[PDB]
Amino acid sequence: NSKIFSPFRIIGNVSNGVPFATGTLGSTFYIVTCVGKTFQIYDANTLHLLFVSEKETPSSIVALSAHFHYVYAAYENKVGIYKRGIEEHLLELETDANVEHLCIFGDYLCASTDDNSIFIYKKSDPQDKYPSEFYTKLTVTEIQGGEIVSLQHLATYLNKLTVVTKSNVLLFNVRTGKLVFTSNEFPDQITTAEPAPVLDIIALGTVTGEVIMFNMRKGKRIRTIKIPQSRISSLSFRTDGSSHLSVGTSSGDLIFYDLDRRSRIHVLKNIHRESYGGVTQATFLNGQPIIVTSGGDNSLKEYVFDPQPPRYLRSRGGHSQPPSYIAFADSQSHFMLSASKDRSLWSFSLRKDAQSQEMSQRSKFPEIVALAIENARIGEWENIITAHKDEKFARTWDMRNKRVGRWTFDTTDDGFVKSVAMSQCGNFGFIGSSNGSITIYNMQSGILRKKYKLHKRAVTGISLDGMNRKMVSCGLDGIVGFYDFNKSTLLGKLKLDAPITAMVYHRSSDLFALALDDLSIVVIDAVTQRVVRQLWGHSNRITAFDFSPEGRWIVSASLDSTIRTWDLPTGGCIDGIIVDNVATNVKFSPNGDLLATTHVTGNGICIWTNRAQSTRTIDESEFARMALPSTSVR
C-alpha cells in the first residue's frame, strides 16, 4: 500500500514468557520459545537459532509442547502441529473455549481448555507421526476437582493421564474414559507440577513455598520441602546422576536443592525480572548438568554445574522494554546499536543467525537519552558515546569488545548531557549541555579539547561536516549555531520560531534537518547557513526522522501515528503510512536498502525494505494503514 516501504522482519525477539518447550534433536536437544504469534527453535548446546515458524497464528500462542520432532502450539480453540517450523496439521477443538494446557504421550494428544474440559485425540495407527482423530472429551466437574493447572504423563502409566488441579490430583484412563483415581483435597493451591525420575512420583509446587512429592499409586505424600515465602513457578529434576531439584519462583530466583542431603544447594538471585513473571520456566537438560531458564523479560539463559555453585554458561536475549534509541553501527549492515528504558545497551546482528550481545557495563547505568556511534576507529579506541538520564557526563563504549569504555565526558557547566555526537573520522566526541555549553573531547585520550558557549537553553543537537570544517548546533532556545571547528569563531546564528528538539545531519549532502515544537521539520544548508526548506503536515509531536542516503528524501515519525516520506526538491509529502503502533525511531540503513523503526510497544526493531531504490504527487488522507512486519519472516 505504501509506495516506498514494505515490511520485512523484526529483530531482537527471543522469548515472551510462555514456558518454553524442550524436544529431541538427534543426539542433542532443542528449545522452543514463544515470540507472540510465532515460535523459535534453538539448539540447546549452542543456543544457535535453528528455526522460526514460517506462518503467524491468528492469535497469541498460549502453550507450547515438544514431542520428538514435532512442536505443538496452542492458540484460541486450536492446536497446531509443526515440523521444522512448518505446520503439518491443525486441530480445531469443538468448543468456543481456549486451550490452556497440552500433554502428548503414547498414541495420545491431550488438550485442556479454560472450561475444565480435556480434549483427547488419538493416533489411528501407533506409527502415525501425530494424533489427528478426535477420540473423547473428558471433563473435570467442580466436585471432581478444581481448576486445571497442569497435564502430565508419568513414566510407565500406560493410557493414563495425570490431571493436576488447584485443589487435587486426578488420574484418568484416556482409553476407557474412567477416572481411576482422585487424591484427597490439597489445602493450599497447586501452581506447578513435574514428574519425578522415579516410579509413581509427581512433584507439586504450591502458592505457599511447598514442594510436595506425591505418590500417585498409593495416593499419599512421601515428602514435603518448604521454601520460605516463595511462590513456586517451575520445577525440574536433575538427571545426570546427582539427585538435585530446581525450583523457580515468581520473584525471579532459581533455587537448587539436594534431595539426598536434604539441604539447599544454592540460589541464583534475580536471573529474571519479577515484574515480567520471574522464572516462567527452568529445565534441566536430560542427562546433562545444564539447566535452561527463561522469563517474560525476553531472555533465555543456560547455567552449568562444573565437576559447587552453578556457573553462567551462555544466553540469548534482547531488551525487556521497547528500544528507546537506535543506530546502524557499520556500513556493511552487520550490527545495530540499541538502547532501551530497561537500562541496557545492546548490539543486534542483522544477519541470519540473529546473534546479539548486551554491551558490558563492567544497578545498571541510568537509561540512555542520546546515542552516537562511528565505525571508523573500531578496535583502536572508544567509538560510542551515550548520554544518561539526569547525569552531567556522557559515557563512552568500545564496539570491538562490546564493553563500556575508559572515558567520561563532563559538560563543565553543571548541566545534564542532552545531546551527543561524533566526527566521521572518530577522533572527536561532542557533548551538548542542558545549560547551553558545547564541549569537544578527544576520543583517543579522553582530554577536553574545546568549549563553546552560545546557547542559553538546552543544546538538543550537535554535528560536524565530514571534513571537520563547520560545526552546527541547535537548542530549545530556537537558535541554530554555526562554528568554525579549526578555530573557535562563531560563524553564524539562525533564530527559528520554535524550540528545536532534535537534529539529523546528512554528511554527504551537508544538509541538516531539525524538529521543531511547532510540528514542522526545518531543513538547512550548512554551507550557506540558510534554511532551504520547511515541512508541514504532522498533526502531533515529531518523534524521529532521517535522510535517505542519497539526500533526496526525509522520512519522519510522529505521535500522530504516521510515518511520512518527504521529497526535498519540492518539500511535499509523497507517501504516508498510518500505523497502529506509534513509531519512536526511524533510521535509514547506510545503503538505501533498509529502514529500521522502533515503536511504543514491542521489544524489537522493525526492518522495512525500501522498494523504491517514484511519483512526486502530494497526498492527504490517501495514507496507507499498514501493519508492522511479521515475526514469522526469516
Side-chain angles (χ1 to χ4, degrees), residues 165-205:
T165 78
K166 293 181 182 174
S167 54
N168 61 8
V169 187
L170 314 179
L171 230 193
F172 285 96
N173 187 306
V174 297
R175 206 192 84 257
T176 64
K178 302 303 175 57
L179 175 60
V180 303
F181 171 81
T182 146
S183 69
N184 308 314
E185 164 193 332
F186 279 74
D188 312 328
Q189 178 173 323
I190 305 176
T191 64
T192 329
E194 173 73 12
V198 302
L199 260 47
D200 301 325
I201 301 189
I202 183 176
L204 310 167

mmCIF file of all heavy atoms in Angstrom, residues 165-205:
data_model
loop_
_atom_site.group_PDB
_atom_site.id
_atom_site.type_symbol
_atom_site.label_atom_id
_atom_site.label_comp_id
_atom_site.label_asym_id
_atom_site.label_seq_id
_atom_site.Cartn_x
_atom_site.Cartn_y
_atom_site.Cartn_z
ATOM 1 N N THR A 165 -5.051 -30.320 39.430
ATOM 2 C CA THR A 165 -5.845 -29.111 39.559
ATOM 3 C C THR A 165 -5.317 -28.290 40.730
ATOM 4 O O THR A 165 -4.333 -28.667 41.367
ATOM 5 C CB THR A 165 -7.331 -29.439 39.795
ATOM 6 O OG1 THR A 165 -7.531 -29.827 41.157
ATOM 7 C CG2 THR A 165 -7.781 -30.567 38.881
ATOM 8 N N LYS A 166 -5.970 -27.167 41.014
ATOM 9 C CA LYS A 166 -5.532 -26.294 42.098
ATOM 10 C C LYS A 166 -5.710 -26.954 43.460
ATOM 11 O O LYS A 166 -4.980 -26.651 44.404
ATOM 12 C CB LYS A 166 -6.298 -24.970 42.067
ATOM 13 C CG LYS A 166 -5.990 -24.105 40.860
ATOM 14 C CD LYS A 166 -6.770 -22.803 40.905
ATOM 15 C CE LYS A 166 -6.502 -21.963 39.673
ATOM 16 N NZ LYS A 166 -7.364 -20.749 39.628
ATOM 17 N N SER A 167 -6.676 -27.866 43.546
ATOM 18 C CA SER A 167 -7.082 -28.442 44.824
ATOM 19 C C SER A 167 -6.766 -29.932 44.972
ATOM 20 O O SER A 167 -6.711 -30.446 46.090
ATOM 21 C CB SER A 167 -8.577 -28.213 45.042
ATOM 22 O OG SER A 167 -9.321 -28.711 43.944
ATOM 23 N N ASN A 168 -6.573 -30.631 43.860
ATOM 24 C CA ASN A 168 -6.248 -32.052 43.935
ATOM 25 C C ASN A 168 -5.498 -32.594 42.719
ATOM 26 O O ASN A 168 -5.074 -31.833 41.847
ATOM 27 C CB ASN A 168 -7.506 -32.890 44.213
ATOM 28 C CG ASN A 168 -8.552 -32.764 43.121
ATOM 29 O OD1 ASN A 168 -8.308 -32.171 42.071
ATOM 30 N ND2 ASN A 168 -9.725 -33.338 43.359
ATOM 31 N N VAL A 169 -5.334 -33.914 42.681
ATOM 32 C CA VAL A 169 -4.679 -34.589 41.570
ATOM 33 C C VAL A 169 -5.524 -35.773 41.118
ATOM 34 O O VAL A 169 -5.847 -36.656 41.914
ATOM 35 C CB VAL A 169 -3.284 -35.111 41.959
ATOM 36 C CG1 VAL A 169 -2.572 -35.653 40.733
ATOM 37 C CG2 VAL A 169 -2.458 -34.015 42.611
ATOM 38 N N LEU A 170 -5.877 -35.790 39.837
ATOM 39 C CA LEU A 170 -6.722 -36.841 39.291
ATOM 40 C C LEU A 170 -5.928 -37.732 38.349
ATOM 41 O O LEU A 170 -4.903 -37.325 37.809
ATOM 42 C CB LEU A 170 -7.912 -36.237 38.541
ATOM 43 C CG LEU A 170 -8.666 -35.105 39.242
ATOM 44 C CD1 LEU A 170 -9.797 -34.594 38.370
ATOM 45 C CD2 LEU A 170 -9.193 -35.574 40.583
ATOM 46 N N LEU A 171 -6.413 -38.954 38.164
ATOM 47 C CA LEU A 171 -5.829 -39.892 37.221
ATOM 48 C C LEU A 171 -6.950 -40.446 36.359
ATOM 49 O O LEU A 171 -7.841 -41.150 36.865
ATOM 50 C CB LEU A 171 -5.144 -41.036 37.963
ATOM 51 C CG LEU A 171 -3.715 -41.408 37.573
ATOM 52 C CD1 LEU A 171 -3.326 -42.746 38.195
ATOM 53 C CD2 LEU A 171 -3.545 -41.438 36.064
ATOM 54 N N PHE A 172 -6.906 -40.113 35.068
ATOM 55 C CA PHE A 172 -7.885 -40.597 34.095
ATOM 56 C C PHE A 172 -7.266 -41.644 33.181
ATOM 57 O O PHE A 172 -6.134 -41.485 32.736
ATOM 58 C CB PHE A 172 -8.380 -39.454 33.203
ATOM 59 C CG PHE A 172 -9.349 -38.518 33.869
ATOM 60 C CD1 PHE A 172 -8.906 -37.341 34.448
ATOM 61 C CD2 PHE A 172 -10.707 -38.795 33.876
ATOM 62 C CE1 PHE A 172 -9.796 -36.467 35.047
ATOM 63 C CE2 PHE A 172 -11.603 -37.927 34.476
ATOM 64 C CZ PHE A 172 -11.147 -36.761 35.062
ATOM 65 N N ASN A 173 -8.013 -42.703 32.886
ATOM 66 C CA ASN A 173 -7.637 -43.612 31.811
ATOM 67 C C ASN A 173 -8.246 -43.084 30.519
ATOM 68 O O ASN A 173 -9.452 -43.185 30.311
ATOM 69 C CB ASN A 173 -8.128 -45.034 32.103
ATOM 70 C CG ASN A 173 -7.625 -46.051 31.090
ATOM 71 O OD1 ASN A 173 -7.799 -45.889 29.882
ATOM 72 N ND2 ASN A 173 -6.998 -47.111 31.585
ATOM 73 N N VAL A 174 -7.410 -42.515 29.655
ATOM 74 C CA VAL A 174 -7.906 -41.839 28.459
ATOM 75 C C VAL A 174 -8.439 -42.791 27.390
ATOM 76 O O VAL A 174 -9.093 -42.357 26.441
ATOM 77 C CB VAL A 174 -6.840 -40.907 27.837
ATOM 78 C CG1 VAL A 174 -6.480 -39.794 28.808
ATOM 79 C CG2 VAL A 174 -5.605 -41.697 27.434
ATOM 80 N N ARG A 175 -8.164 -44.082 27.539
ATOM 81 C CA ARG A 175 -8.673 -45.065 26.590
ATOM 82 C C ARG A 175 -10.094 -45.478 26.951
ATOM 83 O O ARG A 175 -10.955 -45.600 26.078
ATOM 84 C CB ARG A 175 -7.773 -46.302 26.523
ATOM 85 C CG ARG A 175 -7.861 -47.027 25.185
ATOM 86 C CD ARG A 175 -7.200 -48.395 25.212
ATOM 87 N NE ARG A 175 -8.101 -49.416 25.735
ATOM 88 C CZ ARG A 175 -8.033 -49.918 26.962
ATOM 89 N NH1 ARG A 175 -7.095 -49.502 27.799
ATOM 90 N NH2 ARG A 175 -8.904 -50.840 27.349
ATOM 91 N N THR A 176 -10.332 -45.693 28.240
ATOM 92 C CA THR A 176 -11.641 -46.128 28.714
ATOM 93 C C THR A 176 -12.492 -44.948 29.181
ATOM 94 O O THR A 176 -13.715 -45.053 29.269
ATOM 95 C CB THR A 176 -11.518 -47.147 29.860
ATOM 96 O OG1 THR A 176 -10.906 -46.525 30.995
ATOM 97 C CG2 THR A 176 -10.676 -48.342 29.425
ATOM 98 N N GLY A 177 -11.838 -43.828 29.473
ATOM 99 C CA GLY A 177 -12.528 -42.633 29.924
ATOM 100 C C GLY A 177 -12.695 -42.605 31.428
ATOM 101 O O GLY A 177 -13.107 -41.597 31.999
ATOM 102 N N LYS A 178 -12.364 -43.719 32.071
ATOM 103 C CA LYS A 178 -12.566 -43.866 33.506
ATOM 104 C C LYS A 178 -11.649 -42.977 34.338
ATOM 105 O O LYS A 178 -10.448 -42.890 34.083
ATOM 106 C CB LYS A 178 -12.373 -45.327 33.920
ATOM 107 C CG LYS A 178 -13.305 -46.292 33.211
ATOM 108 C CD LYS A 178 -14.761 -45.909 33.428
ATOM 109 C CE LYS A 178 -15.688 -46.795 32.614
ATOM 110 N NZ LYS A 178 -15.493 -48.239 32.932
ATOM 111 N N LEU A 179 -12.234 -42.310 35.328
ATOM 112 C CA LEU A 179 -11.461 -41.621 36.347
ATOM 113 C C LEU A 179 -11.020 -42.672 37.352
ATOM 114 O O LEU A 179 -11.783 -43.053 38.240
ATOM 115 C CB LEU A 179 -12.315 -40.556 37.038
ATOM 116 C CG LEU A 179 -11.703 -39.811 38.227
ATOM 117 C CD1 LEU A 179 -10.437 -39.080 37.812
ATOM 118 C CD2 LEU A 179 -12.711 -38.838 38.830
ATOM 119 N N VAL A 180 -9.795 -43.160 37.197
ATOM 120 C CA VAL A 180 -9.312 -44.256 38.025
ATOM 121 C C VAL A 180 -8.823 -43.781 39.385
ATOM 122 O O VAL A 180 -8.753 -44.567 40.330
ATOM 123 C CB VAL A 180 -8.198 -45.065 37.328
ATOM 124 C CG1 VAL A 180 -8.693 -45.607 35.999
ATOM 125 C CG2 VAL A 180 -6.957 -44.209 37.127
ATOM 126 N N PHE A 181 -8.482 -42.502 39.501
ATOM 127 C CA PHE A 181 -8.023 -42.019 40.803
ATOM 128 C C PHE A 181 -8.323 -40.548 41.067
ATOM 129 O O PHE A 181 -8.315 -39.726 40.157
ATOM 130 C CB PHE A 181 -6.525 -42.301 40.976
ATOM 131 C CG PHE A 181 -5.913 -41.658 42.191
ATOM 132 C CD1 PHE A 181 -6.052 -42.233 43.443
ATOM 133 C CD2 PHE A 181 -5.187 -40.482 42.076
ATOM 134 C CE1 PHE A 181 -5.486 -41.643 44.560
ATOM 135 C CE2 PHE A 181 -4.619 -39.887 43.190
ATOM 136 C CZ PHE A 181 -4.768 -40.470 44.431
ATOM 137 N N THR A 182 -8.603 -40.231 42.326
ATOM 138 C CA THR A 182 -8.712 -38.845 42.761
ATOM 139 C C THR A 182 -8.160 -38.705 44.174
ATOM 140 O O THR A 182 -8.624 -39.369 45.099
ATOM 141 C CB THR A 182 -10.164 -38.313 42.678
ATOM 142 O OG1 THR A 182 -10.400 -37.392 43.750
ATOM 143 C CG2 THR A 182 -11.166 -39.448 42.761
ATOM 144 N N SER A 183 -7.153 -37.852 44.332
ATOM 145 C CA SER A 183 -6.477 -37.705 45.614
ATOM 146 C C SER A 183 -7.327 -36.935 46.609
ATOM 147 O O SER A 183 -8.358 -36.363 46.254
ATOM 148 C CB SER A 183 -5.137 -36.990 45.437
ATOM 149 O OG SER A 183 -5.333 -35.633 45.082
ATOM 150 N N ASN A 184 -6.880 -36.926 47.860
ATOM 151 C CA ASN A 184 -7.505 -36.097 48.875
ATOM 152 C C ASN A 184 -7.291 -34.633 48.519
ATOM 153 O O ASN A 184 -6.386 -34.299 47.752
ATOM 154 C CB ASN A 184 -6.909 -36.393 50.251
ATOM 155 C CG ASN A 184 -6.930 -37.873 50.591
ATOM 156 O OD1 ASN A 184 -7.941 -38.552 50.409
ATOM 157 N ND2 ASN A 184 -5.806 -38.381 51.082
ATOM 158 N N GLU A 185 -8.134 -33.768 49.069
ATOM 159 C CA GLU A 185 -8.021 -32.334 48.850
ATOM 160 C C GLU A 185 -6.664 -31.814 49.316
ATOM 161 O O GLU A 185 -6.162 -32.219 50.365
ATOM 162 C CB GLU A 185 -9.145 -31.605 49.589
ATOM 163 C CG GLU A 185 -8.932 -30.108 49.756
ATOM 164 C CD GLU A 185 -9.901 -29.492 50.748
ATOM 165 O OE1 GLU A 185 -11.020 -30.027 50.899
ATOM 166 O OE2 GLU A 185 -9.542 -28.478 51.384
ATOM 167 N N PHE A 186 -6.065 -30.938 48.518
ATOM 168 C CA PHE A 186 -4.861 -30.228 48.927
ATOM 169 C C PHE A 186 -5.280 -28.889 49.524
ATOM 170 O O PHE A 186 -6.057 -28.153 48.915
ATOM 171 C CB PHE A 186 -3.923 -30.008 47.738
ATOM 172 C CG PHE A 186 -3.077 -31.204 47.397
ATOM 173 C CD1 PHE A 186 -3.631 -32.309 46.769
ATOM 174 C CD2 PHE A 186 -1.722 -31.218 47.694
ATOM 175 C CE1 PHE A 186 -2.852 -33.409 46.453
ATOM 176 C CE2 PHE A 186 -0.938 -32.314 47.379
ATOM 177 C CZ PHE A 186 -1.504 -33.410 46.758
ATOM 178 N N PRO A 187 -4.770 -28.573 50.723
ATOM 179 C CA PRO A 187 -5.159 -27.372 51.472
ATOM 180 C C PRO A 187 -4.764 -26.091 50.751
ATOM 181 O O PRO A 187 -5.550 -25.145 50.681
ATOM 182 C CB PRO A 187 -4.356 -27.493 52.773
ATOM 183 C CG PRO A 187 -3.969 -28.930 52.862
ATOM 184 C CD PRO A 187 -3.771 -29.371 51.452
ATOM 185 N N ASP A 188 -3.547 -26.068 50.223
ATOM 186 C CA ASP A 188 -3.022 -24.878 49.572
ATOM 187 C C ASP A 188 -2.997 -25.063 48.059
ATOM 188 O O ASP A 188 -2.796 -26.172 47.564
ATOM 189 C CB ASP A 188 -1.625 -24.571 50.105
ATOM 190 C CG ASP A 188 -1.564 -24.604 51.626
ATOM 191 O OD1 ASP A 188 -2.578 -24.257 52.271
ATOM 192 O OD2 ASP A 188 -0.508 -24.984 52.174
ATOM 193 N N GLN A 189 -3.201 -23.967 47.335
ATOM 194 C CA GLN A 189 -3.340 -24.007 45.882
ATOM 195 C C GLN A 189 -2.095 -24.528 45.165
ATOM 196 O O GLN A 189 -0.986 -24.038 45.378
ATOM 197 C CB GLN A 189 -3.713 -22.621 45.346
ATOM 198 C CG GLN A 189 -3.840 -22.552 43.834
ATOM 199 C CD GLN A 189 -4.365 -21.209 43.352
ATOM 200 O OE1 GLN A 189 -5.221 -20.596 43.992
ATOM 201 N NE2 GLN A 189 -3.849 -20.745 42.220
ATOM 202 N N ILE A 190 -2.293 -25.526 44.310
ATOM 203 C CA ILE A 190 -1.211 -26.067 43.496
ATOM 204 C C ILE A 190 -1.000 -25.188 42.268
ATOM 205 O O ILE A 190 -1.952 -24.871 41.556
ATOM 206 C CB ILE A 190 -1.507 -27.516 43.051
ATOM 207 C CG1 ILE A 190 -1.795 -28.398 44.269
ATOM 208 C CG2 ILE A 190 -0.344 -28.074 42.239
ATOM 209 C CD1 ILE A 190 -2.204 -29.820 43.928
ATOM 210 N N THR A 191 0.246 -24.795 42.028
ATOM 211 C CA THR A 191 0.576 -23.913 40.916
ATOM 212 C C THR A 191 1.457 -24.584 39.865
ATOM 213 O O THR A 191 1.499 -24.143 38.716
ATOM 214 C CB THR A 191 1.308 -22.654 41.409
ATOM 215 O OG1 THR A 191 2.569 -23.030 41.978
ATOM 216 C CG2 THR A 191 0.477 -21.932 42.456
ATOM 217 N N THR A 192 2.164 -25.640 40.260
ATOM 218 C CA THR A 192 3.123 -26.293 39.372
ATOM 219 C C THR A 192 3.165 -27.804 39.593
ATOM 220 O O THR A 192 2.926 -28.281 40.699
ATOM 221 C CB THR A 192 4.544 -25.745 39.594
ATOM 222 O OG1 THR A 192 4.476 -24.376 40.006
ATOM 223 C CG2 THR A 192 5.368 -25.857 38.321
ATOM 224 N N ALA A 193 3.478 -28.550 38.537
ATOM 225 C CA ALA A 193 3.626 -29.998 38.645
ATOM 226 C C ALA A 193 4.736 -30.508 37.734
ATOM 227 O O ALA A 193 4.984 -29.941 36.668
ATOM 228 C CB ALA A 193 2.315 -30.695 38.332
ATOM 229 N N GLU A 194 5.400 -31.580 38.160
ATOM 230 C CA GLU A 194 6.538 -32.120 37.427
ATOM 231 C C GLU A 194 6.808 -33.573 37.807
ATOM 232 O O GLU A 194 7.086 -33.873 38.969
ATOM 233 C CB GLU A 194 7.783 -31.271 37.697
ATOM 234 C CG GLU A 194 9.071 -31.823 37.114
ATOM 235 C CD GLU A 194 9.151 -31.675 35.605
ATOM 236 O OE1 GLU A 194 8.314 -30.951 35.025
ATOM 237 O OE2 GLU A 194 10.057 -32.282 34.997
ATOM 238 N N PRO A 195 6.723 -34.481 36.824
ATOM 239 C CA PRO A 195 7.044 -35.900 37.012
ATOM 240 C C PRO A 195 8.451 -36.077 37.570
ATOM 241 O O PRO A 195 9.378 -35.414 37.105
ATOM 242 C CB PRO A 195 6.976 -36.460 35.590
ATOM 243 C CG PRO A 195 6.029 -35.560 34.883
ATOM 244 C CD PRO A 195 6.281 -34.196 35.447
ATOM 245 N N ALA A 196 8.597 -36.950 38.562
ATOM 246 C CA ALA A 196 9.898 -37.239 39.159
ATOM 247 C C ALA A 196 10.564 -38.386 38.396
ATOM 248 O O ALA A 196 9.883 -39.145 37.709
ATOM 249 C CB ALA A 196 9.730 -37.589 40.634
ATOM 250 N N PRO A 197 11.898 -38.514 38.502
ATOM 251 C CA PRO A 197 12.570 -39.575 37.742
ATOM 252 C C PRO A 197 12.465 -40.966 38.380
ATOM 253 O O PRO A 197 13.216 -41.862 37.996
ATOM 254 C CB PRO A 197 14.029 -39.109 37.709
ATOM 255 C CG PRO A 197 14.183 -38.298 38.949
ATOM 256 C CD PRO A 197 12.861 -37.603 39.148
ATOM 257 N N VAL A 198 11.553 -41.140 39.332
ATOM 258 C CA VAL A 198 11.299 -42.452 39.915
ATOM 259 C C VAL A 198 9.814 -42.799 39.838
ATOM 260 O O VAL A 198 8.966 -41.913 39.709
ATOM 261 C CB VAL A 198 11.773 -42.541 41.384
ATOM 262 C CG1 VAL A 198 13.262 -42.232 41.490
ATOM 263 C CG2 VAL A 198 10.970 -41.601 42.258
ATOM 264 N N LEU A 199 9.514 -44.093 39.930
ATOM 265 C CA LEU A 199 8.156 -44.620 39.781
ATOM 266 C C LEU A 199 7.106 -43.954 40.667
ATOM 267 O O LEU A 199 7.344 -43.709 41.851
ATOM 268 C CB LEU A 199 8.155 -46.128 40.054
ATOM 269 C CG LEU A 199 8.164 -47.082 38.857
ATOM 270 C CD1 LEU A 199 9.203 -46.665 37.833
ATOM 271 C CD2 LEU A 199 8.418 -48.509 39.328
ATOM 272 N N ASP A 200 5.952 -43.660 40.066
ATOM 273 C CA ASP A 200 4.742 -43.238 40.782
ATOM 274 C C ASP A 200 4.790 -41.852 41.420
ATOM 275 O O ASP A 200 3.823 -41.428 42.053
ATOM 276 C CB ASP A 200 4.352 -44.269 41.848
ATOM 277 C CG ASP A 200 4.101 -45.642 41.265
ATOM 278 O OD1 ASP A 200 3.584 -45.719 40.130
ATOM 279 O OD2 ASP A 200 4.425 -46.641 41.940
ATOM 280 N N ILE A 201 5.899 -41.140 41.259
ATOM 281 C CA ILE A 201 6.060 -39.876 41.967
ATOM 282 C C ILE A 201 5.941 -38.638 41.080
ATOM 283 O O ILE A 201 6.580 -38.536 40.031
ATOM 284 C CB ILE A 201 7.372 -39.843 42.780
ATOM 285 C CG1 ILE A 201 7.380 -40.992 43.790
ATOM 286 C CG2 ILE A 201 7.533 -38.500 43.490
ATOM 287 C CD1 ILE A 201 8.519 -40.944 44.778
ATOM 288 N N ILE A 202 5.101 -37.703 41.513
ATOM 289 C CA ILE A 202 4.985 -36.409 40.859
ATOM 290 C C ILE A 202 5.253 -35.303 41.878
ATOM 291 O O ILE A 202 4.786 -35.368 43.014
ATOM 292 C CB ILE A 202 3.596 -36.230 40.199
ATOM 293 C CG1 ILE A 202 3.519 -34.901 39.447
ATOM 294 C CG2 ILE A 202 2.477 -36.341 41.228
ATOM 295 C CD1 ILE A 202 2.216 -34.701 38.704
ATOM 296 N N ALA A 203 6.035 -34.304 41.479
ATOM 297 C CA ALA A 203 6.331 -33.171 42.348
ATOM 298 C C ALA A 203 5.320 -32.059 42.109
ATOM 299 O O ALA A 203 5.024 -31.715 40.966
ATOM 300 C CB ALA A 203 7.741 -32.670 42.106
ATOM 301 N N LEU A 204 4.791 -31.502 43.194
ATOM 302 C CA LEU A 204 3.766 -30.472 43.105
ATOM 303 C C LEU A 204 4.205 -29.221 43.854
ATOM 304 O O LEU A 204 4.545 -29.288 45.028
ATOM 305 C CB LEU A 204 2.457 -30.984 43.706
ATOM 306 C CG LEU A 204 1.946 -32.343 43.225
ATOM 307 C CD1 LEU A 204 0.837 -32.841 44.137
ATOM 308 C CD2 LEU A 204 1.457 -32.261 41.790
ATOM 309 N N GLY A 205 4.198 -28.081 43.173
ATOM 310 C CA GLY A 205 4.502 -26.816 43.817
ATOM 311 C C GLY A 205 3.226 -26.111 44.236
ATOM 312 O O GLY A 205 2.202 -26.233 43.568
#
